[PDB]
Write an enzyme that holds these catalytic residues in place. Structure first.
Site, PDB file in Angstrom:
ATOM      1  N   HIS A   1       0.867  -1.222   0.000  1.00 44.68           N
ATOM      2  CA  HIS A   1       0.000   0.000   0.000  1.00 44.68           C
ATOM      3  C   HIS A   1       0.875   1.233   0.000  1.00 44.68           C
ATOM      4  CE1 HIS A   1      -3.241  -2.695   0.052  1.00 44.68           C
ATOM      5  NE2 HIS A   1      -2.628  -3.338   1.022  1.00 44.68           N
TER       6      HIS A   1
ATOM      7  N   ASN B   1      -9.767  -3.321   3.157  1.00 43.25           N
ATOM      8  CA  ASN B   1      -9.565  -3.379   1.693  1.00 43.25           C
ATOM      9  C   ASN B   1     -10.888  -3.177   0.986  1.00 43.25           C
ATOM     10  OD1 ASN B   1      -6.903  -3.896   1.847  1.00 43.25           O
ATOM     11  ND2 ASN B   1      -6.913  -6.061   1.544  1.00 43.25           N
TER      12      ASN B   1
ATOM     13  N   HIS C   1      -2.982   1.276  12.099  1.00 43.74           N
ATOM     14  CA  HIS C   1      -2.671  -0.067  12.669  1.00 43.74           C
ATOM     15  C   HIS C   1      -3.963  -0.745  13.058  1.00 43.74           C
ATOM     16  CE1 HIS C   1      -0.825  -3.117  14.951  1.00 43.74           C
ATOM     17  NE2 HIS C   1       0.130  -2.433  15.523  1.00 43.74           N
TER      18      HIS C   1
ATOM     19  N   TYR D   1       2.401  -3.979  12.167  1.00 43.89           N
ATOM     20  CA  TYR D   1       2.328  -2.528  11.915  1.00 43.89           C
ATOM     21  C   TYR D   1       3.229  -1.732  12.806  1.00 43.89           C
ATOM     22  CZ  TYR D   1      -1.523  -3.776   8.886  1.00 43.89           C
ATOM     23  OH  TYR D   1      -2.322  -4.300   7.913  1.00 43.89           O
TER      24      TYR D   1
END
Ligand code: HEM
Ligand code: HEM
Lengths: 727, 727
Positions: free
Chosen positions: B102, B175, B366, B389
């Site tokens: 990403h 997503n 996160h 993360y």
């Protein structure tokens, strides 16, 4: 399991193969017998894989690499899973900062050798003997975009060469145009800020076609020379194999007697100069944004090694001020008509790297890395570059020991009293870490300068002036070199320059910036200015129409070495032809086509409406490389359509589109037998046209005609005809 | 000085304006009155510019920002130029590592509010009152490519939302598809490595169409579900405003009574679902690689704020095992026909950032950032995400104090005993840096859990099992969700899936991988496998032909909520129409066209063969937005051609091509009066065809017809007709 197939089709053959014939692979596996001293020296860090067990980085074999450790098969993952944590941690830390400029680049290994000893003009060891070969590592790049941007943008290209000499690494960090946009390094952040994505929204990528770039240019006329090169077809090279390279700045060569000679460095592409056309380049950034990276890699796997001639423009110290431009001004080129390029040696790139990240992404080049026999000059852009590479590489590559990263390491000896720093690899055993020292008898020791193997001493240039932040008055001339460039281009190159400025300024939202650029073009050449203005709906004023053109450059009204195409230099070896198949291909044509292409080192790509195989009239099974849509005409240099059952592909829209696109992009087309029915789609004459090869069959002279057109690169006479086709 | 023009055209209006009307600008300057608590709290770090002196970072005014300090105006640059050195140093260190995945993304500020109090199911403060507004920051992204790659690639998209709540930051990091490719987080580096650029040569960028991706998919059938979504038109959204969003994992809501409710998070686009077609998306990667970023930014500058409704799928604790699929398996979706999405609140994105780097590139999201009222589950992909993360952000953002970078800071209070770390901004005055302590009376102090404002306590889930690296047997089913998705798609959606698979597998060089993939498709649906096989020249075996289809999903043979288009939800506000002008436009048509478009919030772009302006029949001066080639049909949703002197553009190849491209990509086209001559170019019947609006003038019903077609997004009935056009 495992399932590599029984036929061994997973693994590519370790022999030169044409593009698309075998999957590509790491260089040392593709070409294990290709070697050089640098490639060999990297053997200590190459890591294999076959027959080895999977392990953590601490060497512990892993039994199950498919699952985390959990309390119960549907339970929570446990903190004690050290296998999962090492694996995820290393993945989490994979990325490093990309280069500030030139982040998009493609590299290869090779070797250089001088044609003769250049000891009368330089004591550089790498140019001292024709049988002394020096390994190199070359990285080509775009300039504005990030490392994930597209290759065939309009932009300057970087051309950096790391020479692993016996007296130190020399890095020759150049670009594909012989000048830069600005004069002093202090403005580099301003210029690069203006060309890069705008700060509020980070648009656009890989494009100078936005307001801030054109604002800057319009306010800083010193940029106009390189702007002219960028708006020409030089800004859209066909391949890194087909562009020139330049160190830009005047440097010095120092011989053993101490004599200094000014020098500008050039690379001549032995494959010839060749560029795309804008519409093709822009569409190729969408169809294949990795086109240049792929093309370089596949040329080397095919044995079509990129070759470049190093060349020097040499000016005696006594002739420093004899030109009407300053030799230290990087926005001015030295016309070859004034100072010829002397050929010096040849560079061949013949091996791809094994791991792009380790070798390409972590390579660090610096124009500061010179060796005895070379020196700098006061060019104010070069002077500030000397500070910047070192600084940026510490943060990019994590610390001051970036010379220990394998691709960056010298092949010659390196010994000093520097110690520590993050990720220190070398374990020094010297009792001393300072000099002078008695405890190690002062070793390692300084070495006096000398004809060979001597220490570095700067040329003792006389410096006289006050401490000032001032541009030299001699640099204050901005239009005669842009004009010289303009007048040296062919008419079709001049049209493409006009089109480039028109397209870019049409994307500038603030109209007054467009007008200011036009006003600058009126200081260069009125025909240029008027042609761009007409496309922008701008009308020049009477004052603009009467601006006196700038003076010639030392009596020159043109220099044909500045044009890509005025002097033919076209080579076809390494080019590719698309062959549009049908389901009953006349094998007599195909035989003749492939034999003629093969004889000149031209590759072929067999295309069809689907994947799989098609069978020719004679029973020959033909494997399909890609579909018409899957590998568009953008990716090839020419298109051949053999005879057979043409009805099969005559009503195919993609097949017709393929020819319309290739025609629009000025690529030679050859149609045999019933393939001549496709002439209607590209609407040209019943009797024919130069650039379209046609005959009853693909025989004797048909392939010779097609090959002669490919040697000329594109069909420039077709320009006036392409505007009526809807493609 | 005085480089700005005296009419003030350099500065864009501080009011909503349509795309292309004004230069874009930093959010706070474009919309100074658009505010929220987070935007207000960033005021302390916002830095202006106007009327200030240019200084070094230490506050020293600079006199000459054009030149380095040298000994003589043509002499060497001096080491003491501290001004040059600060400026170059900061430039040299601008870049930071891009996100591991990403890395390409575009973000905006906005706000959320719940429709009603959800206190009966969750004690999360931000969901407790309809009048409670929560500032948000959302970042949309592609997944594979670098930060400089293109937006309209075929790929999953990320949709990450940072909610700045009064009880902590909650990040919902999802997503645009409801499942992920893999089941356990241990395999994330394997999957990601397979989809990313191959390691020897780092190709291809932004594409899963390469051998390693399909090799992995072929070997890991758990991937097929998300692969089906990626190959569908879901993988090429029209805009971030027109795609769905999902958290993927089953999480928990915890109310004040301590009851846990399983939940899956959804975002519904209030603008409706809408995607591009593959050829359009791939060409748009070349013509405008920044298309989604630009579209987001300009929608917000125009007042077309992206709006999304947050929805929850809620499953009682005792229904955990009532489905055919495991609720903790992230490769399985929960069909809306089984468990409806309950509407929860609305999110509006109404302000762009000021600086992309500072706010977008440094933003850190996160999925582990939850707040009291939420909790996790044992989904094994989510469990491993919890670790990753935090880890990756310390290296990406330089240290452990990334929560002090302005965009990441909570708006609520934060106090603890953590100290130091690189780049520490907070100066702690607490006498203690440990607890328990008496020297500061134990402050700050822990807080018990409670109904509101209480400390975080995990839900006491029972754990029972041995420590094992083992996949639950309940996750071992891979083809029924793929088949459910397949059967829920319209026939044209199915064709687009087939086309995606066929295109991508045609790029896989090792034929056996293509065959292995086709075999996996034969376990999903025979029609799908045969259609892809036919396009690859592959013939299924008799055993492949007899593989029994997987079972339905809890009795479901389809669910229309999985289709983009089976249930109309088309909105036209924010869309754009190209208007192809001529040199004598009939202004009656233009007035009617523009007012109709304006009434529905549809934008217009006036195109011509050049820039500048054209004059309509009645003297109306018409400003040209772009040229036909400069702003292709790829960038618009429809094309209108008004009457006037059509001969002026009837011979223009670009004008014709504009319509052929728009036609092939299924966009509505409207032709008025003499503009109907263009019907021959797109080979439409004399009588007409659905999808082509035609009349003598652009009056009453003409614009209503065109707008109706635009509400349906694309003309799907035209699919059979587009194959004969050479476009
Ligand atoms: C004649 C003008 C210039 C040329 C021909 C040039 C060429 C290049 C090339 C080819 C690269 C990429 C090397 C690679 O492939 O890794 C590069 C990188 C870079 N250049 Fe220069 N450049 C010029 C001017 C400047 C100036 C004036 C500065 C700053 C004062 C500068 C700062 C940089 C930096 C910071 C990098 C990144 C280096 C790294 O991260 O390893 N460049 N340049
Ligand atoms: C349901 C599955 C997943 C979804 C929906 C998801 C979604 C996302 C999103 C949207 C982003 C970018 C956030 C931004 O805009 O900055 C992201 C980043 C990231 N993802 Fe996940 N991801 C998933 C699985 C995973 C897994 C299994 C791992 C590793 C165990 C992982 C590791 C990362 C990392 C390292 C980043 C970069 C974070 C940063 O640098 O700030 N992802 N993911």
């Amino acid at each position: 399991d495992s399932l590599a197939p029984e036929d061994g089709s997973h693994r590519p053959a370790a022999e030169p193969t044409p593009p698309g014939a075998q999957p590509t692979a790491p260089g040392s596996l593709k070409a294990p017998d290709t070697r050089n001293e640098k490639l060999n020296s990297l053997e200590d860090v190459r890591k294999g894989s076959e027959n080895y067990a999977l392990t953590t980085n601490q060497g512990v074999r892993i039994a199950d690499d498919q699952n985390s450790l959990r309390a119960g098969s549907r339970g929570p993952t446990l903190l004690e899973d050290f296998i999962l944590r090492e694996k995820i941690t290393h993945f989490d830390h994979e990325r490093i900062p990309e280069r500030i400029v030139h982040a998009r680049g493609s590299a290869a290994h090779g070797y250089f050798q001088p044609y003769k000893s250049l000891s009368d003009i330089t004591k550089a060891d790498f140019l001292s003997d024709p049988n002394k070969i020096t390994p190199v590592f070359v990285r080509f790049s775009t300039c504005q975009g990030g490392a994930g941007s597209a290759d065939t943008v309009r932009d300057i290209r970087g051309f950096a060469t790391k020479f692993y000499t016996e007296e130190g690494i020399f890095d020759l960090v150049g670009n594909n145009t012989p000048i830069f946009f600005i004069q002093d390094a202090h403005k580099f952040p301003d210029f690069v800020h203006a060309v890069k994505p705008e700060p509020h929204w980070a648009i656009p990528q890989g494009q100078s076609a936005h307001d801030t770039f054109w604002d800057y240019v319009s306010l800083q006329p010193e940029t106009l020379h390189n702007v002219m090169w960028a708006m020409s077809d030089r800004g859209i090279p066909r391949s890194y194999r087909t562009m020139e390279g330049f160190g830009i700045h005047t440097f010095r060569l120092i011989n053993a007697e101490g004599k200094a000679t000014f020098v500008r460095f050039h690379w001549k592409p032995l494959a010839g100069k060749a560029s795309l056309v804008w519409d093709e380049a822009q569409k190729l950034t969408g169809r294949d944004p990795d086109f240049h990276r792929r093309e370089l890699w596949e040329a080397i796997e095919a044995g079509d090694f990129p070759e470049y001639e190093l060349g020097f423009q040499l000016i005696p110290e006594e002739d420093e001020f004899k030109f009407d431009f300053d030799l230290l001004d990087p926005t001015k080129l030295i016309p070859e008509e004034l100072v010829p390029v002397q050929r010096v040696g040849k560079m061949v790139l013949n091996r791809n790297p094994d791991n792009f990240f380790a070798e390409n992404e972590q390579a660090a080049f610096h124009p500061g890395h010179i060796v005895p026999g070379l020196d700098f000059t006061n060019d104010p852009l070069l002077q500030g570059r000397l500070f910047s590479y070192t600084d940026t590489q510490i943060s990019r590559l994590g610390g001051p020991n970036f010379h220990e990263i394998p691709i960056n390491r010298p092949t010659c000896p390196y010994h000093n009293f520097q110690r520590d720093g993050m990720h220190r690899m070398g374990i020094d055993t010297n009792p001393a870490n300072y000099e002078p020292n008695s405890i190690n008898d002062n070793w390692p020791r300084e070495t006096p300068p000398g004809p060979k193997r001597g220490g570095f001493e700067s040329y003792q240039e006389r410096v006289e002036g006050n401490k000032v932040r001032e541009r030299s008055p001699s640099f204050g001339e901005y239009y005669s070199h842009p004009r010289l460039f303009w007048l040296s281009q062919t008419p079709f190159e001049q049209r493409h320059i006009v089109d480039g400025f028109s397209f870019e300024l049409s994307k500038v939202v603030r109209p007054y910036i467009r007008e200011r650029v036009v006003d600058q073009l009126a200081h260069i050449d009125l025909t240029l200015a008027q042609a761009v203005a007409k496309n922008l709906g701008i009308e020049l004023t009477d004052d603009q129409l009467n601006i006196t053109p700038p003076p010639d450059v030392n009596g020159l009204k043109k220099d044909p070495s500045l044009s890509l195409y005025a002097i033919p230099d076209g080579d076809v070896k390494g080019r590719v032809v698309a062959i549009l198949l049908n389901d009953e291909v006349r094998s007599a044509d195909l035989l003749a086509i492939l034999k003629a292409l093969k004889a000149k080192g031209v590759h072929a790509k067999l295309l069809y409406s689907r994947m799989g195989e098609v069978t020719a009239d004679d029973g020959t099974v033909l494997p399909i490389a890609a579909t018409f849509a899957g590998a568009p005409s953008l990716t090839v240099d020419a298109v051949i359509v053999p005879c057979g059952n043409i009805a099969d592909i005559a009503d195919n829209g993609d097949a017709n589109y393929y020819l319309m696109e290739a025609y629009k992009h000025l690529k030679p087309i050859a149609l045999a037998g019933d393939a001549r029915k496709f002439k209607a789609t590209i609407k040209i004459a019943d009797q024919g046209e130069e650039g379209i090869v046609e005959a009853d069959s693909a025989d004797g002279s048909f392939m010779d005609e097609l090959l002669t057109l490919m040697a000329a690169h594109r069909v420039w006479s077709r320009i006036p005809k392409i505007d009526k086709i809807p493609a």
